[PDB]
């Protein structure tokens, strides 16, 4: 603090409104409408990680057994998982021709197509609505009803895309090593940025931050941007080369594999990597991330889950198996293995605690008590939308788009300040010349002198003799 | 400074209490001019707060042929009487919007703390109150404000001609 | 094992009734609402493109104007629908500014109106009503002060005596009136300010520094004995009445042509001043000006004070309107006509929403103070949502986005080209002193406030 | 601000009130290349 | 909206409830659903008295909950807290949100008075004021009101100048009602009473009277009488038979006034004003049974 009245009052002030809006948070904080679930012992005996989906069921209320869900369709690939951000619609693409989006709860098949063409992966852009797949050559973008109102053509072999919300932005990794931001509601490609890695074989957004991450085979974490042709920031994850790669939902901690059986959990807010599962019998085919800092392996029949383990303790490292019970070790939270399946890749369902994995015949939603937050935000995203309100929101995140280039490493820079004829036409050619050197010369002369007043600040018995003769 | 209003109706007298006040300048604008019309802005400018009914048909009658010659009826003085804040009667008079510029007279004689306006304003005001007329009553029971009109509208004309049976 | 999950009831949710308003849960987590600073700056930044977008000051003109040009305007310091405007053929009019209509229309002096006050007075023989009638004061070149009645609707309690109660015989010509207020007792500065009474035809008591004529006087809003004078001799004047005298005097560059007091502070006034400028002065000290207001391009004709004491109008004899904020020193608005010509009066309206301006093109107009605020009234919803865009643009207002859209304003091209000539006949001057300072010793730094000030009377310390 | 209770002009109004008022008043690798770039 | 305004108002007293050791957080926030449901059901349109009259009778059930939980969990008669007021405070909020927005309803204006008169102790005579003031402008002529804030008036405080001139504005409203000035009557007679057991209880420790009230009558006589002639006003034949029905009528009234009914002079004094054809017999008959009195 400084030794002045006005600066001490200012200060003062506005520090203490910072600390009534925190104050107003938390008593919003006690009128919250309702409580996240979990699963805990009772005991010293029986662990969390020994039961079973049957047993949940069982156990549970008639709604959430309805709501986990097992699709099976044995004819066409593996399928690839999406939520909508919203919770509420799923999106399912098969590796040959299926794409599905369905309600998913009421269960109206919103849309379906049959491509004989080997598709790869697929979102809802911007509401349940539009959504875009993957195909062999191109990128697509389709209507609520299914037919084709886009072939974005400039994303070649696009494996990898991803939809990023608040800046309407449409990104397209693939396999010639190269990233695309495709601005979706003016429909223009923004940027296109080369990358020297090569095919990149993960990909996630730091929602934080709305930066990208893509995984390259080299064992580097790259973090871009949409406005500057060089990676942010690269990270060395793993050796040979990078599965997967997910981010909490503070844009806080990240969860990388890589086939050399790696697993690190990383600190991206200050880029210490804060440990590395190395312990990893088979490597690691995805990881996910829930809302409430929960984090999900998946090697292939197998999917593990861990609870809290993306803090700072030595503690945290999660493990796979506990001698007498330790208590300072981190077992999983709680397993599940399949028959024989390879899990394709899952997601957490947004506002409810399911996990939802893809796998060889279809799609299976396990049960878990305490994923997702019990309690989302009615003006950012309704799991109960009228039409009317999904529209009128529509516009009104159309409005407030934030500009592409904002898209930045710290989300605050905004704010700072700085202090940021012919004898004619000859004739005055010479004549502006003049004027141009004039100009140069008086420049020279007030250099002079204000070097001499810098000098000025600053400031034998033979010569002695004759000091006075120069 | 408009404060209060007084507004004649077929079934009895009704008093207002002015909320806010439109802004005097800019009365004829569109804008403001379209609130007048609109309930949902009425309703901000406006609140009932009194309402005394008529007894009978005969006391209607009366009261309005008074209300035409301007004078003031019992029952008028004794609403107003009610409704009034007594204010200083030398400083800061309490504001009522009335529709006849011949009735002004007649009440202040009676209430000299009260000070009658027919402007613009006190115009558009009552204008907007007839014009929405029974939702403004916030459910109050009143009597159907058309035959009410037709009743007394009779009854008026024959008492001014001497309309007669023989 | 005991477990539980996530269970929503839809009874919580999706309302039973259809007409039941569905609830909206709401939570502040922040990393539940993402982006801050960018979210904020959009919508701020929409929110200047839509104030550009909805700026529409024009509101109306009254009536059918006056003949020959407009030279006086006085408000209704009590009522808020009145002003009364006067014109150089000689004829003066009292609006109904509610209607943009007029009263009555009274051809008074054969020369010029020369002021106009409006009032009511204080007469000793009776108690004029104060309610259904106003009165003015006009104030003519030929030698007369005249005292009107005017018939006014304001209210509707009553029911002869139209025009002219009283007529006030001169020596001099006259050539600005005021009047002090709560004592019926006006001012009027010809070739020496009389100090009058209503009920006196002769000039009650006589205020003059020397021998120089007064163009212009104002009273004070608080603290009412404290008058000012403009005169011609480019000076001001500081009045007082209690001890009934003049009491200082400071003499600037050029003639300042009008003065206004604040009405929120009770010692600062603000002179409109034929150098282009407007000078905002203490009173106590007199010996510098509190600020200078900068932005126009010919002399400046007339100032007014927002009742509400922050902000100001001025009208000059270029042919603009510009509103300065008491703190700045740079327009925050011009307003500009093709049909507007060497704005002469300036009057800035008593519930601080409007401005009026009378111009001599014989027409008085009235616009919007802030070019925005429709007068409908607002649902709270919208009410809160324009009270956050003003605070967020508040807030960004230096942005350079930001600042570039919500000054770019269109003027006309007399004032463009007036404006960089200006700018470079100031630079010459700037470097010429520069370079005149490089050589020599001994030249004072002479502040920016206190440039303009030639000499004062009663030197103080 | 009038009520209903006080009388308000102190002054009689009807027959009632006059008649009882005057009665009343009468009551009273990897990484090799890591660290190369 | 609205609704999320009235919740964070609601918050800080949940907050102090839920500090001191006397509700759990899972019973809090039930207690909030509830509210919750409440608030929007009243803030949507096409609510209903008894949409408010629920609300109100939740929060009450809510307030006795808090003080047994008080009562028993720390065995405080009142902790010195914000809630203890909150609670009625709220329900006070409700009451008023309510008339403001069904004025007709004369049951919940009642249970409105009934409330904050019973919770009277740290209510206000003013407050009782300003809520009989708001009521009796709405809904002037409503003897039933009138007659129920002179009863309160004169019951609780016996204010008996404040009683008459309430009596006085509730017939210059209705000079219609026989059941006012019959009241008006009752309350003459009991003030009357009331005065002479003073005098009776001074003399202990060491007639105009009756001429008020006979005054009363014949200004009710008079303006009823004129009232029932107003009332279905055309020839000599139909002037006769409307002056029989009224005197029918308003002698009645006399003989109700007979019955409420010192009391011999006053009866004497209805008589002779009555002088002034079986209605003659009965009047004789009452002189002889007077006379056996």
Same mark, same amino acid.
């Given at each position: 603090?400084?030794?002045?009245?006005?600066?001490?009052?200012?200060?003062?002030?506005?520090?203490?409104?910072?600390?009534?809006?925190?104050?107003?948070?938390?008593?919003?904080?006690?009128?919250?409408?309702?409580?996240?679930?979990?699963?805990?012992?009772?005991?010293?005996?029986?662990?969390?990680?020994?039961?079973?989906?049957?047993?949940?069921?069982?156990?549970?209320?008639?709604?959430?057994?309805?709501?986990?869900?097992?699709?099976?369709?044995?004819?066409?690939?593996?399928?690839?998982?999406?939520?909508?951000?919203?919770?509420?619609?799923?999106?399912?693409?098969?590796?040959?021709?299926?794409?599905?989006?369905?309600?998913?709860? %009421?269960?109206?098949?919103?849309?379906?197509?049959?491509?004989?063409?080997?598709?790869?992966?697929?979102?809802?852009?911007?509401?349940?609505?539009?959504?875009?797949?993957?195909?062999?050559?191109?990128?697509?973008?389709?209507?609520?009803?299914?037919?084709?109102?886009?072939?974005?053509?400039?994303?070649?072999?696009?494996?990898?895309?991803?939809?990023?919300?608040?800046?309407?932005?449409?990104?397209?990794?693939?396999?010639?090593?190269?990233?695309?931001?495709?601005?979706?509601?003016?429909? *223009?490609?923004?940027?296109?940025?080369?990358?020297?890695?090569?095919?990149?074989?993960?990909?996630?957004?730091?929602?934080?931050?709305?930066?990208?991450?893509?995984?390259?085979?080299?064992?580097?974490? #790259?973090?871009?941007?949409?406005?500057?042709?060089?990676?942010?920031?690269?990270?060395?994850?793993?050796?040979?080369?990078?599965?997967?790669?997910?981010?909490?939902?503070?844009?806080?901690?990240?969860?990388?594999?890589?086939?050399?059986?790696?697993?690190?959990?990383?600190?991206?807010?200050?880029?210490?990597?804060?440990?590395?599962?190395?312990?990893?019998?088979?490597?690691?085919?995805?990881?996910?991330?829930?809302?409430?800092?929960?984090?999900?392996?998946?090697?292939?029949?197998?999917?593990?889950?861990?609870?809290?383990?993306?803090?700072?303790?030595?503690?945290?490292?999660? +493990?796979?198996?506990?001698?007498?019970?330790?208590?300072?070790?981190?077992?999983?939270?709680?397993?599940?293995?399949?028959?024989?399946?390879?899990?394709?890749?899952?997601?957490?369902?947004?506002?409810?605690?399911?996990?939802?994995?893809?796998?060889?015949?279809?799609?299976?939603?396990?049960?878990?008590?305490?994923?997702?937050?019990?309690?989302?935000?009615?003006?950012?995203?309704?799991?109960?939308?009228?039409?009317?309100?999904? *529209?009128?929101?529509?516009?009104?995140?159309?409005?407030?788009?934030?500009?592409?280039?904002?898209?930045?490493?710290?989300?605050?820079?905004?704010?700072?300040?700085? %202090?940021?004829?012919?004898?004619?036409?000859?004739?005055?050619?010479?004549?502006?010349?003049?004027?141009?050197?004039?100009?140069?010369?008086?420049?020279?002369?007030?250099?002079?002198?204000?070097?001499?007043?810098?000098?000025?600040?600053?400031?034998?018995?033979?010569?002695?003799?004759? #000091?006075?003769?120069? | 400074?408009?404060?209060?209003?007084?507004?004649?109706?077929?079934?009895?007298?009704?008093?207002?209490?002015?909320?806010?006040?439109?802004?005097?300048?800019?009365?004829?604008?569109?804008?403001?001019?379209?609130?007048?019309?609109?309930?949902?802005?009425?309703?901000?400018?406006?609140?009932?707060?009194?309402?005394?009914?008529?007894?009978?048909?005969?006391?209607?009658?009366?009261?309005?042929?008074?209300?035409?010659?301007?004078?003031?009826?019992?029952?008028?003085?004794?609403?107003?009487?009610?409704?009034?804040?007594?204010?200083?009667?030398?400083?800061?008079?309490?504001?009522?919007?009335?529709?006849?510029?011949?009735?002004?007279?007649?009440?202040?004689?009676?209430?000299?703390?009260?000070? +009658?306006?027919?402007?613009?304003?006190?115009?558009?005001?009552?204008?907007? @109150?007839?014009?929405?007329?029974?939702?403004?009553?916030?459910?109050?029971?009143?009597?159907?404000?058309?035959?009410?009109?037709?009743?007394?509208?009779?009854?008026?004309?024959?008492?001014?001609?001497?309309?007669?049976?023989? | 094992?005991?477990?539980?999950?996530?269970?929503?009831?839809?009874?919580?949710?999706?309302?039973?009734?259809?007409?039941?308003?569905?609830?909206?849960?709401?939570?502040?987590?922040?990393?539940?609402?993402?982006?801050?600073?960018?979210?904020?700056?959009?919508?701020?930044?929409?929110?200047?493109?839509?104030?550009?977008?909805?700026?529409?000051?024009?509101?109306?003109?009254?009536?059918?104007?006056?003949?020959?040009?407009?030279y006086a305007?006085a408000?209704?310091?009590?009522?808020?629908?009145?002003?009364?405007?006067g014109?150089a053929?000689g004829?003066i009019?009292?609006?109904?500014? #509610?209607?943009?209509?007029?009263?009555?229309?009274?051809?008074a002096h054969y020369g010029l109106v020369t002021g106009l006050c409006?009032?009511?007075?204080?007469?000793?023989?009776?108690?004029?009503?104060? %309610?259904?009638?106003?009165?003015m004061l006009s104030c003519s070149d030929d030698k007369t002060v005249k005292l009107?009645?005017?018939?006014?609707?304001?209210?509707?309690?009553?029911?002869?005596?139209?025009?002219?109660?009283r007529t006030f015989d001169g020596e001099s010509a006259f050539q600005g009136i005021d009047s002090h207020?709560?004592?019926?007792t006006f001012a009027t500065g010809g070739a020496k300010i009389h100090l009058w009474d209503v009920?006196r035809l002769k000039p009650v008591s006589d205020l003059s520094w020397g021998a120089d004529n007064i163009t212009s006087l104002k009273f004070?809003?608080?603290?009412?004995?404290?008058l000012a004078s403009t005169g011609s001799d480019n000076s001001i004047v500081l009045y007082?009445l209690?001890?009934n005298s003049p009491?200082?005097k400071?003499?600037?560059?050029?003639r300042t042509n009008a003065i206004?007091?604040?009405?929120?502070?009770?010692?600062?006034?603000?002179?409109?001043?034929?150098?282009?400028?407007?000078?905002?002065?203490?009173?106590?000290?007199?010996?510098?000006?509190?600020?200078?207001?900068?932005?126009? @391009?010919?002399?400046?004709?007339?100032?007014?004070?927002?009742?509400?004491?922050?902000?100001?109008?001025?009208?000059?004899?270029?042919?603009?309107?510009?509103?300065?904020?008491?703190?700045?020193?740079?327009?925050?608005?011009?307003?500009?006509?093709?049909?507007?010509?060497?704005?002469?009066?300036?009057?800035?309206?008593?519930? !601080?929403?409007?401005?009026?301006?009378?111009?001599?093109?014989?027409?008085?107009?009235?616009?919007?103070?802030?070019?925005?605020?429709?007068?409908? @009234?607002?649902?709270?919803?919208?009410?809160?949502?324009?009270?956050?865009?003003?605070?967020?643009?508040?807030?960004?207002?230096?942005?350079?986005?930001?600042?570039?859209?919500?000054?770019?304003?269109?003027?006309?091209?007399?004032?463009? %080209?007036?404006?960089? /000539?200006?700018?470079?006949?100031?630079?010459?001057?700037?470097?010429?002193?520069?370079?005149?300072?490089?050589?020599?010793?001994?030249?004072?730094?002479?502040?920016?406030?206190?440039?303009?000030?030639?000499?004062?009377?009663?030197?103080?310390? | 601000?009038?009520?209903?209770?006080?009388?308000?002009?102190?002054?009689?109004?009807?027959?009632?009130?006059?008649?009882?008022?005057?009665?009343?008043?009468?009551?009273?690798?990897?990484?090799?290349?890591?660290?190369?770039? | 909206?609205?609704?999320?305004?009235?919740?964070? *108002?609601?918050?800080?007293?949940?907050?102090?409830?839920?500090?001191?050791?006397?509700?759990?957080?899972?019973?809090?926030?039930?207690?909030?659903?509830?509210?919750?449901?409440?608030?929007?059901?009243?803030?949507?349109?096409?609510?209903?008295?008894?949409?408010?009259?629920?609300?109100?009778?939740?929060?009450?059930?809510?307030?006795?909950?808090?003080?047994?939980?008080?009562?028993?969990? =720390?065995?405080?008669?009142?902790?010195?807290?914000?809630?203890?007021?909150?609670?009625?405070?709220?329900?006070?909020?409700?009451?008023?949100?309510?008339?403001?927005?069904?004025? *007709?309803?004369?049951?919940?204006?009642?249970?409105?008075?009934?409330?904050?008169?019973?919770?009277?102790?740290?209510?206000?005579?003013?407050?009782?004021?300003?809520?009989?003031?708001?009521?009796?402008? =709405?809904?002037?002529?409503?003897?039933?009101?009138?007659?129920?804030?002179?009863?309160?008036?004169?019951?609780?405080?016996?204010?008996?100048?404040?009683?008459?001139?309430?009596?006085?504005?509730?017939?210059?409203?209705?000079?219609?009602?026989?059941?006012?000035?019959?009241?008006?009557?009752?309350?003459?007679?009991?003030?009357?009473?009331?005065?002479?057991?003073?005098?009776?209880?001074?003399?202990?420790?060491?007639?105009?009277?009756?001429?008020?009230?006979?005054?009363?009558?014949?200004? +009710?006589?008079?303006?009823?009488?004129?009232?029932?002639?107003?009332?279905?006003?055309?020839?000599?034949?139909?002037?006769?038979?409307?002056?029989?029905?009224?005197?029918?009528?308003?002698? !009645?009234?006399?003989?109700?006034? /007979?019955?409420?009914?010192?009391?011999?002079?006053?009866?004497?004094?209805?008589?002779?004003?009555?002088?002034?054809?079986?209605?003659?017999?009965?009047? @004789?008959?009452?002189?002889?049974?007077?006379?056996?009195?």
């Amino acid at each position: 603090q400084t030794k002045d009245k006005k600066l001490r009052a200012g200060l003062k002030k506005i520090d203490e409104q910072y600390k009534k809006a925190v104050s107003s948070a938390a008593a919003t904080d006690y009128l919250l409408p309702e409580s996240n679930g979990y699963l805990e012992p009772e005991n010293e005996l029986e662990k969390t990680f020994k039961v079973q989906q049957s047993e949940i069921k069982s156990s549970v209320d008639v709604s959430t057994a309805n709501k986990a869900l097992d699709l099976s369709l044995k004819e066409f690939g593996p399928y690839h998982i999406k939520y909508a951000k919203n919770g509420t619609h799923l999106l399912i693409t098969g590796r040959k021709g299926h794409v599905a989006s369905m309600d998913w709860r %009421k269960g109206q098949l919103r849309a379906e197509l049959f491509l004989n063409e080997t598709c790869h992966s697929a979102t809802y852009l911007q509401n349940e609505q539009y959504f875009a797949v993957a195909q062999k050559k191109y990128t697509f973008i389709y209507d609520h009803e299914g037919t084709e109102l886009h072939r974005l053509k400039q994303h070649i072999e696009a494996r990898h895309l991803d939809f990023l919300p608040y800046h309407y932005l449409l990104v397209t990794a693939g396999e010639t090593g190269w990233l695309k931001y495709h601005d979706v509601s003016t429909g *223009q490609l923004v940027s296109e940025l080369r990358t020297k890695a090569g095919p990149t074989m993960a990909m996630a957004q730091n929602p934080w931050n709305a930066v990208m991450h893509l995984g390259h085979s080299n064992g580097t974490v #790259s973090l871009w941007s949409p406005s500057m042709p060089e990676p942010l920031v690269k990270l060395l994850s793993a050796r040979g080369p990078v599965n997967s790669i997910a981010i909490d939902r503070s844009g806080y901690y990240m969860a990388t594999t890589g086939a050399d059986r790696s697993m690190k959990i990383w600190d991206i807010r200050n880029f210490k990597q804060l440990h590395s599962v190395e312990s990893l019998p088979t490597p690691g085919t995805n990881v996910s991330i829930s809302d409430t800092g929960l984090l999900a392996l998946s090697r292939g029949p197998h999917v593990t889950l861990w609870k809290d383990a993306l803090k700072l303790s030595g503690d945290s490292k999660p +493990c796979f198996g506990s001698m007498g019970g330790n208590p300072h070790r981190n077992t999983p939270y709680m397993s599940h293995l399949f028959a024989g399946n390879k899990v394709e890749n899952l997601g957490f369902v947004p506002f409810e605690d399911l996990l939802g994995v893809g796998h060889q015949t279809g799609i299976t939603n396990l049960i878990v008590p305490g994923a997702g937050e019990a309690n989302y935000d009615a003006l950012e995203l309704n799991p109960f939308e009228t039409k009317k309100q999904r *529209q009128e929101q529509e516009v009104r995140t159309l409005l407030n788009k934030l500009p592409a280039d904002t898209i930045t490493l710290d989300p605050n820079s905004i704010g700072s300040v700085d %202090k940021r004829s012919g004898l004619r036409s000859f004739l005055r050619k010479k004549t502006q010349n003049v004027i141009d050197e004039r100009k140069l010369r008086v420049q020279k002369q007030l250099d002079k002198e204000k070097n001499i007043r810098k000098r000025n600040h600053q400031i034998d018995v033979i010569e002695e003799a004759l #000091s006075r003769f120069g | 400074p408009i404060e209060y209003l007084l507004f004649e109706e077929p079934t009895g007298y009704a008093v207002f209490k002015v909320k806010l006040q439109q802004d005097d300048i800019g009365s004829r604008l569109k804008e403001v001019q379209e609130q007048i019309n609109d309930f949902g802005a009425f309703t901000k400018l406006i609140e009932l707060v009194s309402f005394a009914p008529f007894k009978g048909a005969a006391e209607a009658l009366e009261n309005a042929n008074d209300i035409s010659e301007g004078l003031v009826s019992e029952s008028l003085k004794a609403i107003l009487d009610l409704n009034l804040p007594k204010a200083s009667s030398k400083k800061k008079n309490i504001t009522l919007a009335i529709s006849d510029k011949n009735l002004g007279p007649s009440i202040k004689e009676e209430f000299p703390y009260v000070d +009658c306006i027919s402007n613009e304003l006190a115009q558009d005001l009552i204008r907007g @109150v007839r014009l929405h007329g029974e939702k403004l009553f916030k459910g109050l029971q009143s009597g159907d404000l058309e035959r009410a009109q037709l009743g007394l509208g009779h009854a008026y004309s024959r008492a001014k001609v001497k309309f007669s049976v023989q | 094992m005991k477990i539980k999950t996530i269970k929503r009831s839809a009874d919580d949710y999706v309302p039973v009734k259809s007409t039941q308003e569905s609830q909206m849960p709401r939570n502040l987590n922040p990393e539940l609402h993402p982006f801050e600073r960018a979210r904020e700056y959009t919508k701020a930044l929409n929110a200047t493109k839509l104030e550009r977008m909805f700026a529409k000051p024009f509101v109306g003109q009254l009536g059918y104007g006056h003949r020959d040009g407009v030279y006086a305007i006085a408000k209704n310091y009590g009522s808020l629908n009145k002003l009364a405007t006067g014109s150089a053929d000689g004829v003066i009019k009292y609006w109904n500014m #509610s209607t943009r209509e007029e009263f009555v229309s009274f051809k008074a002096h054969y020369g010029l109106v020369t002021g106009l006050c409006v009032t009511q007075p204080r007469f000793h023989d009776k108690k004029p009503d104060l %309610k259904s009638q106003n009165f003015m004061l006009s104030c003519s070149d030929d030698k007369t002060v005249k005292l009107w009645s005017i018939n006014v609707d304001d209210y509707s309690n009553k029911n002869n005596e139209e025009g002219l109660i009283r007529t006030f015989d001169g020596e001099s010509a006259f050539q600005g009136i005021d009047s002090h207020r709560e004592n019926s007792t006006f001012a009027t500065g010809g070739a020496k300010i009389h100090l009058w009474d209503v009920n006196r035809l002769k000039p009650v008591s006589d205020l003059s520094w020397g021998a120089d004529n007064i163009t212009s006087l104002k009273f004070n809003q608080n603290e009412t004995d404290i008058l000012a004078s403009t005169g011609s001799d480019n000076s001001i004047v500081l009045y007082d009445l209690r001890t009934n005298s003049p009491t200082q005097k400071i003499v600037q560059t050029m003639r300042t042509n009008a003065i206004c007091w604040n009405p929120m502070e009770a010692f600062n006034f603000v002179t409109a001043n034929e150098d282009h400028n407007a000078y905002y002065y203490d009173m106590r000290n007199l010996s510098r000006s509190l600020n200078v207001f900068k932005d126009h @391009v010919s002399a400046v004709m007339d100032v007014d004070f927002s009742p509400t004491g922050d902000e100001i109008v001025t009208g000059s004899y270029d042919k603009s309107i510009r509103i300065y904020k008491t703190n700045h020193g740079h327009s925050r608005e011009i307003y500009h006509t093709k049909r507007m010509q060497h704005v002469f009066q300036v009057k800035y309206s008593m519930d !601080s929403k409007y401005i009026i301006s009378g111009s001599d093109d014989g027409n008085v107009r009235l616009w919007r103070s802030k070019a925005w605020e429709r007068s409908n @009234v607002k649902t709270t919803r919208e009410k809160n949502k324009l009270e956050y865009d003003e605070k967020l643009k508040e807030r960004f207002r230096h942005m350079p986005e930001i600042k570039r859209i919500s000054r770019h304003r269109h003027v006309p091209q007399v004032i463009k %080209k007036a404006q960089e /000539i200006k700018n470079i006949e100031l630079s010459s001057i700037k470097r010429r002193e520069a370079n005149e300072r490089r050589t020599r010793k001994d030249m004072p730094y002479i502040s920016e406030r206190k440039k303009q000030i030639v000499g004062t009377v009663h030197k103080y310390e | 601000h009038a009520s209903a209770f006080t009388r308000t002009q102190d002054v009689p109004q009807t027959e009632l009130q006059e008649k009882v008022d005057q009665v009343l008043q009468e009551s009273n690798d990897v990484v090799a290349e890591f660290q190369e770039e | 909206s609205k609704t999320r305004y009235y919740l964070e *108002q609601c918050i800080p007293e949940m907050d102090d409830l839920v500090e001191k050791g006397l509700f759990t957080k899972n019973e809090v926030s039930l207690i909030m659903k509830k509210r919750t449901d409440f608030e929007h059901r009243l803030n949507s349109r096409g609510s209903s008295i008894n949409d408010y009259i629920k609300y109100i009778n939740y929060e009450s059930n809510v307030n006795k909950l808090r003080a047994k939980r008080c009562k028993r969990i =720390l065995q405080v008669k009142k902790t010195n807290s914000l809630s203890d007021w909150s609670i009625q405070q709220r329900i006070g909020f409700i009451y008023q949100r309510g008339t403001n927005k069904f004025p *007709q309803d004369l049951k919940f204006w009642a249970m409105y008075l009934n409330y904050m008169k019973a919770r009277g102790n740290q209510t206000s005579y003013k407050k009782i004021h300003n809520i009989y003031n708001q009521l009796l402008k =709405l809904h002037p002529t409503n003897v039933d009101i009138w007659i129920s804030c002179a009863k309160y008036e004169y019951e609780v405080h016996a204010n008996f100048k404040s009683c008459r001139n309430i009596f006085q504005n509730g017939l210059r409203f209705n000079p219609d009602v026989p059941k006012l000035w019959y009241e008006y009557v009752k309350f003459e007679l009991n003030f009357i009473t009331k005065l002479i057991n003073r005098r009776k209880v001074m003399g202990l420790i060491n007639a105009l009277r009756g001429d008020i009230a006979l005054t009363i009558f014949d200004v +009710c006589m008079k303006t009823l009488g004129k009232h029932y002639i107003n009332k279905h006003k055309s020839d000599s034949k139909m002037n006769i038979e409307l002056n029989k029905e009224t005197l029918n009528y308003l002698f !009645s009234e006399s003989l109700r006034y /007979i019955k409420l009914f010192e009391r011999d002079y006053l009866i004497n004094h209805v008589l002779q004003f009555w002088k002034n054809p079986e209605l003659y017999l009965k009047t @004789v008959m009452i002189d002889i049974t007077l006379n056996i009195r």
